[PDB]
């Protein structure tokens, strides 16, 4: 179990970030494994993967995902120039992250249709400090807690709607919670 930060563990990059609010425990396990337990958290994002990511990675994940409230399970990462926070959301709790967002299209990948959206974060935390930036979303219709994600299928679909990615920064399978509670235990490869 560790404090917020980034690093490398057992061959995998990890990032664990929170907004300073208590109630979250993040633990790195062997290999590509991590777990998170949270109770009345604030906002946090943690998981394992790669630094940098690539635009053609096939990401495998498996384990348990037991949110109680607002939470996401996603392939999650960033680019620079442009600065983009992106999500390929495989499962979520009580809140669909695209609520209120303008849909731009659909993509079929890895056994499901996904709906695609762009949103904007204004003056928020980011990998380069406080910033305004776009977010790109693919939201899986058929929720799951194990499988493989062909990231290129999403990135290509996004590109056809002008949702351009820059040079990749990190790319993880992330568990996110937003003022909620839950448990998750995920192995990445
Ligand atoms: O040392 C630094 C290091 O700290 C830095 O790390 C970066 C910092 O930025 C991180 O990026 C964060 C990650 O979180 C991203 O999350 C956002 C949070 O907002 C979410 O939207 C919210 C969704 O819930 C909505 O509320 C609902 C409303 O309906 C109700 O019924 C329901 O109960 C309720 O929950 C809410 O209104 C809404 O605002 C959004 O979905 C989500 O994407 C965030 O964008 C981003 O800022 C990054 O992870 C770290 O790596 O790196 C640099 C070092 O120098």
PDB file of C-alpha atoms and ligand atoms in Angstrom:
ATOM      1  CA  UNK A   1       0.000   0.000   0.000  1.00  0.00           C
ATOM      2  CA  UNK A   2       1.338   3.426  -1.020  1.00  0.00           C
ATOM      3  CA  UNK A   3       0.816   7.195  -1.049  1.00  0.00           C
ATOM      4  CA  UNK A   4      -0.161   9.039  -4.235  1.00  0.00           C
ATOM      5  CA  UNK A   5       2.534   9.068  -6.874  1.00  0.00           C
ATOM      6  CA  UNK A   6       3.799   7.263  -9.932  1.00  0.00           C
ATOM      7  CA  UNK A   7       6.461   4.675 -10.486  1.00  0.00           C
ATOM      8  CA  UNK A   8       7.243   1.193 -11.699  1.00  0.00           C
ATOM      9  CA  UNK A   9       6.365  -2.080 -10.000  1.00  0.00           C
ATOM     10  CA  UNK A  10       7.047  -5.596 -11.251  1.00  0.00           C
ATOM     11  CA  UNK A  11       7.469  -4.514 -14.873  1.00  0.00           C
ATOM     12  CA  UNK A  12       4.490  -2.151 -15.000  1.00  0.00           C
ATOM     13  CA  UNK A  13       4.063   1.579 -14.665  1.00  0.00           C
ATOM     14  CA  UNK A  14       1.580   2.636 -12.006  1.00  0.00           C
ATOM     15  CA  UNK A  15      -0.175   5.874 -11.198  1.00  0.00           C
ATOM     16  CA  UNK A  16      -2.145   6.503  -8.026  1.00  0.00           C
ATOM     17  CA  UNK A  17      -3.655   9.971  -7.686  1.00  0.00           C
ATOM     18  CA  UNK A  18      -6.220  11.387  -5.331  1.00  0.00           C
ATOM     19  CA  UNK A  19      -7.639  14.829  -4.628  1.00  0.00           C
ATOM     20  CA  UNK A  20      -6.319  14.917  -1.068  1.00  0.00           C
ATOM     21  CA  UNK A  21      -9.473  13.491   0.461  1.00  0.00           C
ATOM     22  CA  UNK A  22      -9.051  10.417   2.640  1.00  0.00           C
ATOM     23  CA  UNK A  23     -10.847   7.107   2.399  1.00  0.00           C
ATOM     24  CA  UNK A  24      -8.787   5.363  -0.297  1.00  0.00           C
ATOM     25  CA  UNK A  25      -6.237   2.565  -0.048  1.00  0.00           C
ATOM     26  CA  UNK A  26      -4.241   1.631  -3.165  1.00  0.00           C
ATOM     27  CA  UNK A  27      -1.944  -1.397  -3.196  1.00  0.00           C
ATOM     28  CA  UNK A  28       0.441  -2.760  -5.825  1.00  0.00           C
ATOM     29  CA  UNK A  29       0.579  -6.528  -6.065  1.00  0.00           C
ATOM     30  CA  UNK A  30       2.745  -9.004  -7.938  1.00  0.00           C
ATOM     31  CA  UNK A  31       3.073  -8.741 -11.697  1.00  0.00           C
ATOM     32  CA  UNK A  32       0.409  -6.548 -13.265  1.00  0.00           C
ATOM     33  CA  UNK A  33      -1.886  -6.663 -10.214  1.00  0.00           C
ATOM     34  CA  UNK A  34      -3.219  -3.804  -8.131  1.00  0.00           C
ATOM     35  CA  UNK A  35      -6.130  -3.332  -5.799  1.00  0.00           C
ATOM     36  CA  UNK A  36      -8.087  -0.442  -4.375  1.00  0.00           C
ATOM     37  CA  UNK A  37     -10.483  -0.225  -1.458  1.00  0.00           C
ATOM     38  CA  UNK A  38     -12.359   2.975  -0.773  1.00  0.00           C
ATOM     39  CA  UNK A  39     -14.944   4.218   1.682  1.00  0.00           C
ATOM     40  CA  UNK A  40     -16.454   7.690   1.394  1.00  0.00           C
ATOM     41  CA  UNK A  41     -13.616   8.811  -0.871  1.00  0.00           C
ATOM     42  CA  UNK A  42     -13.104  11.978  -2.828  1.00  0.00           C
ATOM     43  CA  UNK A  43     -11.933  11.721  -6.441  1.00  0.00           C
ATOM     44  CA  UNK A  44      -9.124   9.243  -7.126  1.00  0.00           C
ATOM     45  CA  UNK A  45      -7.646   7.341 -10.057  1.00  0.00           C
ATOM     46  CA  UNK A  46      -5.222   4.436  -9.764  1.00  0.00           C
ATOM     47  CA  UNK A  47      -3.891   1.519 -11.747  1.00  0.00           C
ATOM     48  CA  UNK A  48      -1.146  -0.214 -13.701  1.00  0.00           C
ATOM     49  CA  UNK A  49       0.064  -0.231 -17.272  1.00  0.00           C
ATOM     50  CA  UNK A  50       2.658   1.535 -19.356  1.00  0.00           C
ATOM     51  CA  UNK A  51       4.638   4.753 -19.668  1.00  0.00           C
ATOM     52  CA  UNK A  52       4.372   5.777 -22.411  1.00  0.00           C
ATOM     53  CA  UNK A  53       1.347   4.095 -23.876  1.00  0.00           C
ATOM     54  CA  UNK A  54       1.018   3.353 -27.562  1.00  0.00           C
ATOM     55  CA  UNK A  55      -1.678   3.858 -30.171  1.00  0.00           C
ATOM     56  CA  UNK A  56      -1.812   0.136 -31.027  1.00  0.00           C
ATOM     57  CA  UNK A  57      -1.691  -1.570 -27.643  1.00  0.00           C
ATOM     58  CA  UNK A  58      -3.930  -4.535 -26.897  1.00  0.00           C
ATOM     59  CA  UNK A  59      -4.586  -4.341 -23.146  1.00  0.00           C
ATOM     60  CA  UNK A  60      -5.786  -7.321 -21.129  1.00  0.00           C
ATOM     61  CA  UNK A  61      -7.451  -7.052 -17.748  1.00  0.00           C
ATOM     62  CA  UNK A  62      -9.204  -9.315 -15.291  1.00  0.00           C
ATOM     63  CA  UNK A  63     -10.333  -9.437 -11.700  1.00  0.00           C
ATOM     64  CA  UNK A  64     -13.122  -8.112  -9.533  1.00  0.00           C
ATOM     65  CA  UNK A  65     -14.808  -4.741  -9.613  1.00  0.00           C
ATOM     66  CA  UNK A  66     -17.338  -3.936  -6.885  1.00  0.00           C
ATOM     67  CA  UNK A  67     -18.243  -0.256  -6.807  1.00  0.00           C
ATOM     68  CA  UNK A  68     -20.843   1.202  -4.430  1.00  0.00           C
ATOM     69  CA  UNK A  69     -21.671   4.485  -6.117  1.00  0.00           C
ATOM     70  CA  UNK A  70     -19.875   6.577  -8.704  1.00  0.00           C
ATOM     71  CA  UNK A  71     -16.867   4.677 -10.067  1.00  0.00           C
ATOM     72  CA  UNK A  72     -15.319   3.708 -13.404  1.00  0.00           C
ATOM     73  CA  UNK A  73     -13.176   0.811 -14.654  1.00  0.00           C
ATOM     74  CA  UNK A  74     -11.351   1.936 -17.788  1.00  0.00           C
ATOM     75  CA  UNK A  75      -8.381   1.976 -20.020  1.00  0.00           C
ATOM     76  CA  UNK A  76      -7.245   5.466 -19.041  1.00  0.00           C
ATOM     77  CA  UNK A  77      -4.416   7.681 -20.159  1.00  0.00           C
ATOM     78  CA  UNK A  78      -3.083  10.918 -21.484  1.00  0.00           C
ATOM     79  CA  UNK A  79      -1.467  12.524 -24.461  1.00  0.00           C
ATOM     80  CA  UNK A  80       0.544  15.740 -24.800  1.00  0.00           C
ATOM     81  CA  UNK A  81       0.316  18.279 -27.680  1.00  0.00           C
ATOM     82  CA  UNK A  82      -2.611  18.064 -27.573  1.00  0.00           C
ATOM     83  CA  UNK A  83      -3.175  17.500 -23.874  1.00  0.00           C
ATOM     84  CA  UNK A  84      -5.981  14.948 -23.690  1.00  0.00           C
ATOM     85  CA  UNK A  85      -7.307  12.766 -20.885  1.00  0.00           C
ATOM     86  CA  UNK A  86      -8.958   9.687 -22.406  1.00  0.00           C
ATOM     87  CA  UNK A  87     -11.111   6.822 -21.249  1.00  0.00           C
ATOM     88  CA  UNK A  88     -12.243   3.521 -22.735  1.00  0.00           C
ATOM     89  CA  UNK A  89     -14.802   2.683 -20.056  1.00  0.00           C
ATOM     90  CA  UNK A  90     -15.434  -1.036 -19.603  1.00  0.00           C
ATOM     91  CA  UNK A  91     -17.646  -0.852 -16.503  1.00  0.00           C
ATOM     92  CA  UNK A  92     -19.018   1.765 -14.106  1.00  0.00           C
ATOM     93  CA  UNK A  93     -21.166   2.132 -10.984  1.00  0.00           C
ATOM     94  CA  UNK A  94     -24.177   4.382 -10.513  1.00  0.00           C
ATOM     95  CA  UNK A  95     -23.145   7.211 -12.870  1.00  0.00           C
ATOM     96  CA  UNK A  96     -22.543   7.025 -16.609  1.00  0.00           C
ATOM     97  CA  UNK A  97     -19.590   9.400 -17.167  1.00  0.00           C
ATOM     98  CA  UNK A  98     -21.132  10.586 -20.447  1.00  0.00           C
ATOM     99  CA  UNK A  99     -24.265  11.932 -18.742  1.00  0.00           C
ATOM    100  CA  UNK A 100     -25.000  15.341 -20.272  1.00  0.00           C
ATOM    101  CA  UNK A 101     -22.206  14.979 -22.831  1.00  0.00           C
ATOM    102  CA  UNK A 102     -22.639  15.372 -26.576  1.00  0.00           C
ATOM    103  CA  UNK A 103     -22.314  12.075 -28.433  1.00  0.00           C
ATOM    104  CA  UNK A 104     -20.118  12.070 -31.556  1.00  0.00           C
ATOM    105  CA  UNK A 105     -20.449   8.504 -32.792  1.00  0.00           C
ATOM    106  CA  UNK A 106     -20.031   4.807 -32.076  1.00  0.00           C
ATOM    107  CA  UNK A 107     -17.364   2.139 -32.461  1.00  0.00           C
ATOM    108  CA  UNK A 108     -17.573  -1.647 -32.237  1.00  0.00           C
ATOM    109  CA  UNK A 109     -14.624  -3.344 -30.561  1.00  0.00           C
ATOM    110  CA  UNK A 110     -13.865  -6.408 -28.462  1.00  0.00           C
ATOM    111  CA  UNK A 111     -17.420  -7.677 -28.424  1.00  0.00           C
ATOM    112  CA  UNK A 112     -19.464  -4.521 -27.823  1.00  0.00           C
ATOM    113  CA  UNK A 113     -20.606  -1.246 -29.239  1.00  0.00           C
ATOM    114  CA  UNK A 114     -19.194   1.816 -27.509  1.00  0.00           C
ATOM    115  CA  UNK A 115     -20.607   5.337 -27.600  1.00  0.00           C
ATOM    116  CA  UNK A 116     -18.100   8.143 -28.171  1.00  0.00           C
ATOM    117  CA  UNK A 117     -18.087  11.587 -26.519  1.00  0.00           C
ATOM    118  CA  UNK A 118     -15.898  14.637 -26.008  1.00  0.00           C
ATOM    119  CA  UNK A 119     -16.062  16.755 -22.853  1.00  0.00           C
ATOM    120  CA  UNK A 120     -13.925  19.583 -21.465  1.00  0.00           C
ATOM    121  CA  UNK A 121     -12.312  20.007 -18.050  1.00  0.00           C
ATOM    122  CA  UNK A 122     -11.703  23.633 -17.102  1.00  0.00           C
ATOM    123  CA  UNK A 123      -8.876  24.601 -14.729  1.00  0.00           C
ATOM    124  CA  UNK A 124      -8.524  21.079 -13.316  1.00  0.00           C
ATOM    125  CA  UNK A 125      -5.701  18.792 -12.219  1.00  0.00           C
ATOM    126  CA  UNK A 126      -3.719  17.112 -14.971  1.00  0.00           C
ATOM    127  CA  UNK A 127      -0.404  15.475 -15.719  1.00  0.00           C
ATOM    128  CA  UNK A 128       1.023  18.978 -16.341  1.00  0.00           C
ATOM    129  CA  UNK A 129      -0.675  20.727 -13.405  1.00  0.00           C
ATOM    130  CA  UNK A 130      -3.803  22.863 -13.385  1.00  0.00           C
ATOM    131  CA  UNK A 131      -5.090  23.057 -16.931  1.00  0.00           C
ATOM    132  CA  UNK A 132      -8.003  23.171 -19.306  1.00  0.00           C
ATOM    133  CA  UNK A 133      -8.183  20.152 -21.588  1.00  0.00           C
ATOM    134  CA  UNK A 134     -10.512  17.916 -23.554  1.00  0.00           C
ATOM    135  CA  UNK A 135     -11.479  14.424 -22.530  1.00  0.00           C
ATOM    136  CA  UNK A 136     -12.263  11.664 -25.029  1.00  0.00           C
ATOM    137  CA  UNK A 137     -14.620   8.854 -24.018  1.00  0.00           C
ATOM    138  CA  UNK A 138     -15.613   5.490 -25.412  1.00  0.00           C
ATOM    139  CA  UNK A 139     -18.287   4.007 -23.135  1.00  0.00           C
ATOM    140  CA  UNK A 140     -18.932   0.283 -23.444  1.00  0.00           C
ATOM    141  CA  UNK A 141     -22.585  -0.721 -23.707  1.00  0.00           C
ATOM    142  CA  UNK A 142     -22.017  -4.261 -22.396  1.00  0.00           C
ATOM    143  CA  UNK A 143     -20.317  -3.829 -19.059  1.00  0.00           C
ATOM    144  CA  UNK A 144     -17.599  -6.247 -18.027  1.00  0.00           C
ATOM    145  CA  UNK A 145     -14.738  -6.679 -15.569  1.00  0.00           C
ATOM    146  CA  UNK A 146     -12.383  -8.799 -17.672  1.00  0.00           C
ATOM    147  CA  UNK A 147     -11.402  -8.824 -21.317  1.00  0.00           C
ATOM    148  CA  UNK A 148      -9.098  -7.279 -23.877  1.00  0.00           C
ATOM    149  CA  UNK A 149      -9.170  -3.775 -25.349  1.00  0.00           C
ATOM    150  CA  UNK A 150      -7.767  -3.066 -28.809  1.00  0.00           C
ATOM    151  CA  UNK A 151      -6.992   0.588 -28.144  1.00  0.00           C
ATOM    152  CA  UNK A 152      -6.338   1.327 -31.832  1.00  0.00           C
ATOM    153  CA  UNK A 153      -9.985   0.716 -32.674  1.00  0.00           C
ATOM    154  CA  UNK A 154     -10.994   3.510 -30.311  1.00  0.00           C
ATOM    155  CA  UNK A 155      -8.227   5.880 -31.278  1.00  0.00           C
ATOM    156  CA  UNK A 156      -9.094   5.437 -34.967  1.00  0.00           C
ATOM    157  CA  UNK A 157     -12.807   6.022 -34.347  1.00  0.00           C
ATOM    158  CA  UNK A 158     -12.029   9.151 -32.342  1.00  0.00           C
ATOM    159  CA  UNK A 159      -9.756  10.428 -35.107  1.00  0.00           C
ATOM    160  CA  UNK A 160     -12.606  10.187 -37.626  1.00  0.00           C
ATOM    161  CA  UNK A 161     -14.468  12.765 -35.499  1.00  0.00           C
ATOM    162  CA  UNK A 162     -11.453  15.060 -35.215  1.00  0.00           C
ATOM    163  CA  UNK A 163     -10.633  13.762 -31.742  1.00  0.00           C
ATOM    164  CA  UNK A 164      -6.868  13.887 -32.321  1.00  0.00           C
ATOM    165  CA  UNK A 165      -4.393  12.414 -29.867  1.00  0.00           C
ATOM    166  CA  UNK A 166      -0.970  13.819 -29.250  1.00  0.00           C
ATOM    167  CA  UNK A 167       2.193  12.035 -28.237  1.00  0.00           C
ATOM    168  CA  UNK A 168       1.256   9.425 -25.648  1.00  0.00           C
ATOM    169  CA  UNK A 169       1.971   9.803 -21.963  1.00  0.00           C
ATOM    170  CA  UNK A 170       0.858   7.065 -19.540  1.00  0.00           C
ATOM    171  CA  UNK A 171      -1.724   4.384 -20.322  1.00  0.00           C
ATOM    172  CA  UNK A 172      -3.197   2.224 -17.565  1.00  0.00           C
ATOM    173  CA  UNK A 173      -6.137   0.117 -16.564  1.00  0.00           C
ATOM    174  CA  UNK A 174      -7.590   2.422 -13.921  1.00  0.00           C
ATOM    175  CA  UNK A 175     -10.109   2.194 -11.165  1.00  0.00           C
ATOM    176  CA  UNK A 176     -11.651   5.580 -10.457  1.00  0.00           C
ATOM    177  CA  UNK A 177     -13.979   6.554  -7.634  1.00  0.00           C
ATOM    178  CA  UNK A 178     -15.841   9.826  -7.203  1.00  0.00           C
ATOM    179  CA  UNK A 179     -17.142  10.479  -3.670  1.00  0.00           C
ATOM    180  CA  UNK A 180     -18.156   6.858  -3.313  1.00  0.00           C
ATOM    181  CA  UNK A 181     -17.151   3.497  -1.829  1.00  0.00           C
ATOM    182  CA  UNK A 182     -16.010   0.229  -3.354  1.00  0.00           C
ATOM    183  CA  UNK A 183     -13.509  -2.541  -3.873  1.00  0.00           C
ATOM    184  CA  UNK A 184     -11.537  -3.625  -6.944  1.00  0.00           C
ATOM    185  CA  UNK A 185      -8.718  -6.032  -7.662  1.00  0.00           C
ATOM    186  CA  UNK A 186      -7.369  -6.029 -11.201  1.00  0.00           C
ATOM    187  CA  UNK A 187      -4.524  -7.708 -13.077  1.00  0.00           C
ATOM    188  CA  UNK A 188      -3.202  -6.079 -16.227  1.00  0.00           C
ATOM    189  CA  UNK A 189      -1.120  -7.430 -19.102  1.00  0.00           C
TER     190      UNK A 189
HETATM  191  O1  LIG B   1       2.148  15.474  -8.803  1.00  0.00           O
HETATM  192  C1  LIG B   1       1.413  15.702 -10.022  1.00  0.00           C
HETATM  193  C2  LIG B   1       0.241  14.728 -10.032  1.00  0.00           C
HETATM  194  O2  LIG B   1      -0.584  15.040  -8.952  1.00  0.00           O
HETATM  195  C3  LIG B   1      -0.537  14.810 -11.351  1.00  0.00           C
HETATM  196  O3  LIG B   1      -1.465  13.782 -11.408  1.00  0.00           O
HETATM  197  C4  LIG B   1      -2.537  13.840 -12.310  1.00  0.00           C
HETATM  198  C5  LIG B   1      -3.580  14.853 -11.802  1.00  0.00           C
HETATM  199  O4  LIG B   1      -4.710  14.857 -12.677  1.00  0.00           O
HETATM  200  C6  LIG B   1      -5.355  13.567 -12.654  1.00  0.00           C
HETATM  201  O5  LIG B   1      -6.459  13.714 -13.507  1.00  0.00           O
HETATM  202  C7  LIG B   1      -7.743  13.903 -12.925  1.00  0.00           C
HETATM  203  C8  LIG B   1      -8.337  12.523 -12.723  1.00  0.00           C
HETATM  204  O6  LIG B   1      -9.674  12.565 -12.473  1.00  0.00           O
HETATM  205  C9  LIG B   1     -10.374  12.996 -13.640  1.00  0.00           C
HETATM  206  O7  LIG B   1     -11.726  12.762 -13.173  1.00  0.00           O
HETATM  207  C10 LIG B   1     -12.917  13.445 -13.572  1.00  0.00           C
HETATM  208  C11 LIG B   1     -13.562  13.945 -12.296  1.00  0.00           C
HETATM  209  O8  LIG B   1     -14.820  14.535 -12.594  1.00  0.00           O
HETATM  210  C12 LIG B   1     -15.699  13.590 -13.125  1.00  0.00           C
HETATM  211  O9  LIG B   1     -16.909  14.227 -13.337  1.00  0.00           O
HETATM  212  C13 LIG B   1     -17.751  14.171 -12.195  1.00  0.00           C
HETATM  213  C14 LIG B   1     -18.584  12.966 -12.249  1.00  0.00           C
HETATM  214  O10 LIG B   1     -19.515  12.826 -11.149  1.00  0.00           O
HETATM  215  C15 LIG B   1     -20.451  13.858 -11.229  1.00  0.00           C
HETATM  216  O11 LIG B   1     -21.255  13.783 -10.089  1.00  0.00           O
HETATM  217  C16 LIG B   1     -22.243  12.971 -10.151  1.00  0.00           C
HETATM  218  C17 LIG B   1     -23.496  13.768 -10.580  1.00  0.00           C
HETATM  219  O12 LIG B   1     -24.703  12.959 -10.553  1.00  0.00           O
HETATM  220  C18 LIG B   1     -24.994  12.451  -9.265  1.00  0.00           C
HETATM  221  O13 LIG B   1     -26.205  11.780  -9.355  1.00  0.00           O
HETATM  222  C19 LIG B   1     -23.860  11.617  -8.761  1.00  0.00           C
HETATM  223  O14 LIG B   1     -24.077  11.191  -7.335  1.00  0.00           O
HETATM  224  C20 LIG B   1     -22.509  12.250  -8.733  1.00  0.00           C
HETATM  225  O15 LIG B   1     -21.467  11.399  -8.428  1.00  0.00           O
HETATM  226  C21 LIG B   1     -19.826  15.192 -11.183  1.00  0.00           C
HETATM  227  O16 LIG B   1     -20.787  16.242 -11.338  1.00  0.00           O
HETATM  228  C22 LIG B   1     -18.683  15.343 -12.271  1.00  0.00           C
HETATM  229  O17 LIG B   1     -18.027  16.602 -12.224  1.00  0.00           O
HETATM  230  C23 LIG B   1     -15.173  13.068 -14.457  1.00  0.00           C
HETATM  231  O18 LIG B   1     -16.030  12.034 -14.912  1.00  0.00           O
HETATM  232  C24 LIG B   1     -13.812  12.549 -14.325  1.00  0.00           C
HETATM  233  O19 LIG B   1     -13.283  12.304 -15.642  1.00  0.00           O
HETATM  234  C25 LIG B   1     -10.057  14.445 -13.875  1.00  0.00           C
HETATM  235  O20 LIG B   1     -10.614  14.914 -15.128  1.00  0.00           O
HETATM  236  C26 LIG B   1      -8.542  14.775 -13.828  1.00  0.00           C
HETATM  237  O21 LIG B   1      -8.488  16.146 -13.498  1.00  0.00           O
HETATM  238  C27 LIG B   1      -4.417  12.513 -13.191  1.00  0.00           C
HETATM  239  O22 LIG B   1      -5.033  11.218 -13.057  1.00  0.00           O
HETATM  240  C28 LIG B   1      -3.129  12.492 -12.438  1.00  0.00           C
HETATM  241  O23 LIG B   1      -2.220  11.603 -13.077  1.00  0.00           O
HETATM  242  O24 LIG B   1       0.399  14.585 -12.406  1.00  0.00           O
HETATM  243  C29 LIG B   1       1.401  15.642 -12.410  1.00  0.00           C
HETATM  244  C30 LIG B   1       2.238  15.608 -11.209  1.00  0.00           C
HETATM  245  O25 LIG B   1       3.179  16.691 -11.304  1.00  0.00           O
END
